[PDB]
Design an enzyme around this catalytic site. Structure first.
Site, short mmCIF file in Angstrom:
data_model
loop_
_atom_site.label_atom_id
_atom_site.label_comp_id
_atom_site.label_asym_id
_atom_site.label_seq_id
_atom_site.Cartn_x
_atom_site.Cartn_y
_atom_site.Cartn_z
N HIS A 93 5.84 11.51 -30.05
CA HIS A 93 4.88 10.93 -29.11
C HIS A 93 3.84 10.28 -30.01
O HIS A 93 3.76 10.58 -31.22
CB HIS A 93 4.18 11.99 -28.22
CG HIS A 93 5.09 12.75 -27.30
ND1 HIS A 93 5.68 12.20 -26.19
CD2 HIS A 93 5.45 14.05 -27.29
CE1 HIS A 93 6.41 13.10 -25.56
NE2 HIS A 93 6.29 14.25 -26.21
N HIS A 122 -5.60 0.35 -25.94
CA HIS A 122 -5.66 -1.07 -25.78
C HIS A 122 -7.07 -1.44 -26.16
O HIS A 122 -7.34 -2.61 -26.32
CB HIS A 122 -5.40 -1.52 -24.32
CG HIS A 122 -3.94 -1.53 -23.92
ND1 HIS A 122 -3.50 -2.03 -22.70
CD2 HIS A 122 -2.83 -1.13 -24.60
CE1 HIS A 122 -2.17 -1.93 -22.66
NE2 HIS A 122 -1.74 -1.38 -23.79
N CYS A 132 1.32 6.23 -24.49
CA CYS A 132 2.26 6.55 -25.54
C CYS A 132 3.23 5.37 -25.67
O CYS A 132 3.57 4.70 -24.67
CB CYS A 132 3.06 7.79 -25.10
SG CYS A 132 4.24 8.34 -26.37
N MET A 157 2.78 9.09 -19.26
CA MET A 157 1.97 9.18 -20.44
C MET A 157 1.12 7.95 -20.59
O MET A 157 1.44 7.07 -21.36
CB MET A 157 2.88 9.38 -21.67
CG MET A 157 2.23 10.14 -22.79
SD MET A 157 3.50 11.08 -23.74
CE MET A 157 2.45 11.84 -24.94
N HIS A 198 -7.40 -2.14 -2.60
CA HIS A 198 -8.19 -2.55 -1.46
C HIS A 198 -8.89 -1.32 -0.92
O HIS A 198 -8.23 -0.31 -0.72
CB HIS A 198 -7.28 -3.16 -0.36
CG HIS A 198 -7.96 -3.39 0.96
ND1 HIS A 198 -8.83 -4.43 1.19
CD2 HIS A 198 -7.89 -2.70 2.12
CE1 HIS A 198 -9.29 -4.36 2.43
NE2 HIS A 198 -8.71 -3.33 3.03
N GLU A 204 -12.00 -8.69 -0.84
CA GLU A 204 -11.32 -7.78 0.06
C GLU A 204 -10.26 -6.91 -0.72
O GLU A 204 -10.14 -5.67 -0.55
CB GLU A 204 -10.69 -8.57 1.22
CG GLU A 204 -9.54 -9.59 0.79
CD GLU A 204 -9.09 -10.42 1.89
OE1 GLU A 204 -8.73 -9.91 2.99
OE2 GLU A 204 -9.07 -11.61 1.67
N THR A 205 -9.56 -7.56 -1.62
CA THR A 205 -8.50 -6.91 -2.42
C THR A 205 -8.56 -7.58 -3.77
O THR A 205 -8.81 -8.83 -3.85
CB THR A 205 -7.20 -7.26 -1.76
OG1 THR A 205 -7.25 -6.78 -0.43
CG2 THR A 205 -5.95 -6.67 -2.54
N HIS A 220 -2.37 -2.67 -1.75
CA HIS A 220 -2.20 -3.39 -0.50
C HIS A 220 -0.79 -4.09 -0.38
O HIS A 220 -0.59 -4.99 0.44
CB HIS A 220 -3.45 -4.28 -0.15
CG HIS A 220 -3.62 -4.49 1.34
ND1 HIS A 220 -2.70 -5.18 2.10
CD2 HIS A 220 -4.55 -4.05 2.21
CE1 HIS A 220 -3.09 -5.20 3.35
NE2 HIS A 220 -4.22 -4.54 3.44
O1 LIG Z 1 -6.93 -2.84 5.44
N1 LIG Z 1 -6.15 -1.82 4.74
O2 LIG Z 1 -4.69 -1.94 4.73
O1 LIG Z 2 0.25 -1.70 -25.89
N1 LIG Z 2 1.51 -2.42 -25.80
O2 LIG Z 2 2.50 -1.95 -24.82
CU LIG Z 3 5.20 10.07 -25.40
CU LIG Z 4 -5.62 -4.21 4.97
CU LIG Z 5 0.28 -1.32 -23.98
#
Ligand SMILES: O=N[O-]
Ligand SMILES: O=N[O-]
Ligand SMILES: [Cu+2]
Ligand SMILES: [Cu+2]
Ligand SMILES: [Cu+2]
Ligand SMILES: O=N[O-]
Ligand SMILES: O=N[O-]
Ligand SMILES: O=N[O-]
Ligand SMILES: O=N[O-]
Ligand SMILES: [Cu+2]
Ligand SMILES: [Cu+2]
Ligand SMILES: [Cu+2]
Lengths: 329, 329, 329
Positions: free
Chosen positions: C83, C88, C124, C139, C244, C268-269, C295
């Site tokens: 692992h 990022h 990972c 992970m 949303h 909204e979203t 959504h």
């Molecule tokens: O407005 N929520 O699906």
């Molecule tokens: O952080 N690259 O999958």
């Molecule tokens: Cu892993």
């Molecule tokens: Cu909605």
């Molecule tokens: Cu990545």
């Protein structure tokens, strides 16, 4: 406050309105009737639809930021389902869902303040599993809340459209009989379990503008003239889209749909997040046929997501010219 | 106006150009030859390709905003299909599609004005169902229209790249024989109906950079040095991508691809809308191997969407340091 | 530099922190233990998980821009896999992946400088095919790097949250026995080949918040009060999401997740790119139950992507009012 009654026009058109508010805040009264019916999606393909006012999408409502919206929602007694409405434009009670659940043969009147400018989805959302099923049966539409002082561009100057078209995109999950043909049903509930299996794969069978393949082509083709500034408001209540105007561009685009945000300019294709409506302005420069598509071209052509715009006017060879026509090698 | 002839280089490289325009508006002459051929996507997997100049993607063209582009497109007589070209950079006639449809053994010359700055897809789009099939067979590429005064950042100051790489991502739908092995065909048309069934599921079998799995790894690995400002132009003509530089960032990103828009900074991953090309600058700080991926890691690793960048230079322990090496508990 | 030790709290909560930095740059010490275990995703559905600290997502780490992060990563001897960790947030060595690969029964200590503000995925990424498999086994997690001077809005004024919740969304690919029931396995490796086949279809079986269907509902429901400004940090390491707030909005949204970028308002979203974390602030105006969803409502309801927020406070009829209750026609 003044009250203003409105008569909704089915999409892709828009009821009458002013861009810049004529008055101070008002109360906007709308009424819609829920209609359950089988609609035809394509040559060989039907949907047990559930609609706001008989259309997919449901009609465009337009108001100004800080107005109120007061909607009488009616569920006629021949319908078989409870239904409600969630306005993404609205604050509280699950967008109004929590206060508008009506049985076949009831009405309800909801008021909300439109505190936020933008185009917003509204959709039915009865509760749990009924939420996605009702939306993917066509029950969604759009409301557009224009700033009081009309639209502004990236640096705050007024921009004005000559035409607005409301393009409602919807994904559907039509199940198939053993023979590979799309199934028909007598009512929505009969179709419920087989639609679910298709929905679980997340692959739409159809993805359509204004409720049907080709609905916005042929007799349905949108229309404009060179020099028209057109606003294309595009909703997708459940799945993403990547709208593109073939032969054109988005001059100003609010792809997240909210007019106080700076729009982007000169876009080739933009992105409508499932669960949302976006807006793009374009001022036509060239005459001829355009196509407005979801630019997963499989979606645009195999699934249904193509509209046409027919544009009249003078051609400009400075922008484009066929220098040498198709000739042998 | 002056005319300037160009010799295209296959991707991921770029023909010679200036960032800041040397001259006033010019006419840019390009020529491409359509090539249909089976290409190898992976160890066990081939595609009946349809290409602009023999490459997937088609080569990068670079011009400046307000130049013209005059392209001779040639469809050699051994090809089996009509073909055309739609520049998303262009205004009118379906991006030029409507004026460039040529049969095997014809040419055509199209001129358009590059009125809008940005990186833009160009692709073939013969009409109806031929539109998605031809694109998913590799017929798409990119044109980059640089502002006359070079690139500017979020607050309008000039930024300059030392290297540009054109990364063209493409999704493909390779059908399989009864035994679960990918099918080979003699020509594209023989493959058409079985490709369609795969396309209808919207699940790509491969999703590749520069035309093949690993094309931009090993001998194909991109190269830079600490301190290089690299522009990564990334196209996807048909489906979304979420580019990420592992070990790096996007310093300035125009994910919708249009240089007059404010770029975003410090991005971990950005979004290329299917039907579009975007651009990200990054100035390398650390030596070693990087990977440029579509960050649906299933797409990056199982489908093909991984490129490598090999970077030489001095390591900086201030940015990162292995404090205690891998040791037993 | 001062060193500061931290005790991580499992999601959706956050370890203690200041928004505006109390001090100058410091060194932030964290420790996590890798835990492999079967987790329960749903009534009938289990996952061979691979986790950072026993949770999906892995816990939220918070620091300020220009601090350092020094992490002791431990892979206990009962685990069956190597692992590592890729931040990022970090510059070099594949986000730290290249310097942190540990076998069952080893530890490693990595230091990186947090040179860039935003919320960032960490996950990972052992190498090749192990990359997507390990991520889709849970992970991944998030680190949030706050600007030294707290958050600023679109025009540079300070904004302050009263609460932060970390919402980690993850897609999973649970394979099924011949009978259509989800398979159980003794260890992850036993499940590897059958998970792969599901992964190749790109269709998740589940898509969950905080590691399980309903994990953030019922006893897990998030909580606030009218007037609270809540920051919703939302990660998705592998696939896109479209968050949303039903009944609410995003007041300020950095959907690409990086705080020096101008946020958008009134959304909204919004859109979380797979491979990324985004952030939205919302100041609650109305009491009652809200739902936070992906959504694609099929994803929200059939796949697992729904959380609830329970909000206490005074109701405001000016924002919304049921004018006429559900009554017969
Ligand atoms: O407005 N929520 O699906
Ligand atoms: O952080 N690259 O999958
Ligand atoms: Cu892993
Ligand atoms: Cu909605
Ligand atoms: Cu990545
Ligand atoms: O505002 N369009 O008539
Ligand atoms: O350029 N329209 O697919
Ligand atoms: O402009 N790159 O040589
Ligand atoms: O900074 N929230 O206690
Ligand atoms: Cu309904
Ligand atoms: Cu072609
Ligand atoms: Cu196109």
């Amino acid at each position: 406050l003044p009250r203003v009654k409105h008569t909704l026009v089915p999409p892709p058109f828009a009821h009458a309105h002013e861009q810049v508010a004529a008055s101070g805040p008002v109360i906007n009264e709308f009424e819609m009737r829920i209609i359950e019916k089988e609609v035809q999606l394509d040559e060989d393909a039907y949907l047990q639809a559930m609609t706001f006012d008989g259309s997919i999408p449901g009609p465009l409502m337009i108001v100004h930021e800080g107005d109120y919206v007061e909607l009488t929602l009616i569920n006629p007694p021949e319908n078989t389902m409870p239904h409600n409405i969630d306005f993404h434009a609205a604050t509280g009670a699950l967008g109004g869902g929590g206060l508008t659940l009506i049985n076949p043969g009831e009405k309800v009147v909801l008021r909300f303040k439109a505190t936020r400018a933008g185009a917003f989805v509204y959709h039915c959302a009865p509760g749990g599993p009924m939420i996605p099923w009702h939306v993917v049966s066509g029950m969604a539409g759009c409301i557009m809340v224009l700033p009081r002082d009309g639209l502004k561009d990236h640096e705050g100057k007024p921009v004005r459209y000559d035409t607005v078209y409301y393009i409602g995109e919807s994904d559907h999950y039509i199940p198939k009989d053993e023979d590979g043909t799309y199934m028909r049903f007598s009512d929505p509930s009969e179709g419920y379990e087989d639609m679910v299996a298709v929905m679980d794969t997340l692959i739409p069978s159809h993805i359509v503008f204004n409720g049907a393949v080709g609905a916005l082509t042929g007799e349905g083709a949108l229309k404009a003239k060179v020099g028209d500034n057109v606003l294309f408001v595009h909703s997708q209540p459940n799945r993403d889209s990547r709208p593109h105007l073939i032969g054109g561009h988005g001059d100003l685009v609010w792809e997240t749909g909210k007019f106080h945000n700076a729009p982007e300019r000169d876009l080739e294709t933009w992105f409508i997040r499932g669960g949302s409506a976006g807006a793009a302005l374009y001022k036509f420069l060239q005459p001829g046929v355009y196509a407005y598509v979801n630019h997963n071209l499989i979606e645009a052509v195999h699934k249904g997501a193509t509209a046409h715009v027919l544009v009249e006017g003078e051609w400009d060879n400075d922008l484009m010219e066929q220098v040498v026509a198709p000739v042998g090698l």
